[model samples]
Target: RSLPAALRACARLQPHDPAFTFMDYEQDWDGVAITLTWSQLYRRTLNVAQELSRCGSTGDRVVISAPQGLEYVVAFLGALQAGRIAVPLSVPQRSDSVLSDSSPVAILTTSSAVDDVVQHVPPSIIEVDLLDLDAPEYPSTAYLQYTPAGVVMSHQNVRVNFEQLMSGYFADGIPPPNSALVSWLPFYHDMGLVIGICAPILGGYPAVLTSPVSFLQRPARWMHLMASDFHAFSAAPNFAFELAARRTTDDDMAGRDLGNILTILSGSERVQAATIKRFADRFARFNLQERVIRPSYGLAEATVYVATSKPGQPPETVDFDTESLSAGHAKPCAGATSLISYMLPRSPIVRIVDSDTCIECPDGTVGEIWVHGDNVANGYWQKPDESERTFGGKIVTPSPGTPEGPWLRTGDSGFVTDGKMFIIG
Candidate 1:
């Protein structure tokens, strides 16, 4: 809902700004792309929505089986705009199992894909209509996210995370002002979706996007693309950093420098120290800032972002004695393998709880990380009991003024010490 609504705002306030771009590199490592302005994206989305309205009923499932292109983005948004559940299939699925379970009334595909997709669709499944962005309240379901099981993400669940990540970063100027999103992440995964699609639209910034194929084909291109924009904020896993740094050569960065990159977040799990140091050293000559590589943590259950190390400096890593850590005591001494730390950006409080007693752990104690936040998902898609088990942890020993129940059991084990969360497990 926010995406379509945000697109409307983009059309009105920044009609000519490039809203999205899909970097197509058929021949060269330096990729070329098609840029979609806010106005064009808004109207194309509307056209797709209207077509869906004419052909399908409200609440019907529509499968968007298309190749990785701007069309895929348009179809996904259009499905939501038409008030239809969008089933975006990137690869041809176990067609029988997925389609049979969802039983979509219509299947939308690009002209290039129609021939290939027709084999699975078997001829199953609009007019113009206004998008219902504000009609639904916070609890409404928004994305199944490629039919990820047992996770029902409400609109607010998705909305809150984007706002949480953006508001704090922009407010604190953690990411450079007027920063554009430079991403090579795919649009299907949670981190990729949020970073490339949602954040750019929500923040009203240009999205210089490249497909996984482009990035995998030449990691150096990611750096060149970032150099193309002075204010570029990017996020990726630690592996990508290693891959890009290892593969990047003098030729790729001959006349360019990553000094222009606003920030690059290494997220999803613990960012290896070696990974960070290697990347930093490699790009040091390219004028990349020392602290530009920030460690971040996130959860699919929590939409995406939970905590990120503030960007203007290197992440704080505390090494703990191995024996102490083995025995569940996080002794911060001259120590063993260390962990990167993070401060919560905003709402969605973080606490470590002893699983056996369901009581909160004191600072410096090891336990489960429970996140109670506005961005927490509603529950499992249809598994109520499992949802209650996972997303319904109650804090028996609550801190003063803190609520006791309904926190997300993040499953990952960690400890809080000195106001920083160290998520090792």
Candidate 2:
């Protein structure tokens, strides 16, 4: 039911199957790819988890500081396996404030990175380099794999969010068995952390990945990999789509066809219909299907996924009168701008509420986006006042069929009208 359990499930079901392949392009753009069978990953994670479990009591927090390579994932899973919360942070930037706040008992790093890690990591905490693939290794390790956790989510919260999104994508095998991920999203971001590292283990699918730096160096590499790699579906922030479309030339994709790709999810930023149109049109000649691009929406507090445009179809958009929109009403009319539409899935409950009145706004009106679901986080890390203010929303007069207080006030404004939601910033 948790991430650790899913890793165990993968190893038991497909012990020798390749679970994750990290393509390291640091030395060369056509990089050396390292494949970790489920058994190998499980054993490495077990060694780290067992060590950390001995170091700290349950519910302890650990800082995971490593490069975007595969070790970051091992450290993160190891933290969960040892019943510690993983405070995942980008490498080298000693935000130090986070260190003070999380006050992690240890910083899980790598044999190759310990020198630089310690430079930034405070001397007060234990520095544990969990693994070194290039050196003598510890393969003799195993433990109960059912332990549970996430950053702010308990074990159950993490599992529910994983199930929440997968339910929509996998119902009736909708994403197709061959639609494996070929991802370049950074593992620190919420979407990347889940889509790149967690989702494959949960779904029992192969994930071919490279760092975002590799994708940025030559935007062509992404499209090229999608064509040559295993039937690849990928995810990225909205900007990457525009960047890929802008930088990729005919020569870069001379013999490639994106027809087999099923899901190219773009989110974590405002999704512009213009960007979608430009990317879809640019790749159409290369057999990229327009419907496969899922312009999605989500929040880290919601466990990274909330609502996404329907699959196997183009995104829907509606126009509201520009003047009425300025006047705080959403009258459907002509528009100089367009919005990508998403219908709230049954797994989630979304309400458009007036910020001032704390009342649910009827359709064709604008208001705050409040989310109620198992996916929403319980609260922030420590401050009760901030948590309550952000997460403890209520309705002046509760709408019919709506649950009571405790909705997550997203702070963003949007509306639902004519049956689909269009977020207006």
Best by TM-score: 2
Error (Å) of candidate 2 at residue 64 is 0.7
Taking the tens digit of each residue's C-alpha lDDT, what string does model 1 give over 231-321?
7778888899889998989888989977877678886775786788789898999898968788778877888888877556877777888
Clashing pairs in 1: 50-127, 51-126, 52-126, 53-126, 53-127, 54-126, 54-127, 55-126, 105-125, 106-125
Q: In model 2, where do residues sit more than 4 Å from their true spots?
A: 122-151, 167-175
Model 2: colliding residue pairs: none
Off by over 4 Å in 1: 27-29, 93-101, 115-139, 146-150, 171-178
For model 2, how does the per-residue alpha-carbon lDDT over 140-245 read when each residue is reduced to its tens digit?
1111111012236555555666777775455454346556778888776777877888778877888888888888898888897788646777778888889999
Reference-based lDDT, residue 192, model 2: 81
Which ten-residue region of model 1 has the weakest summed lDDT?
Answer: 127-136
lDDT score at residue 177, model 1, on the 0-100 scale? 52
Model 1 clashes, total count: 10
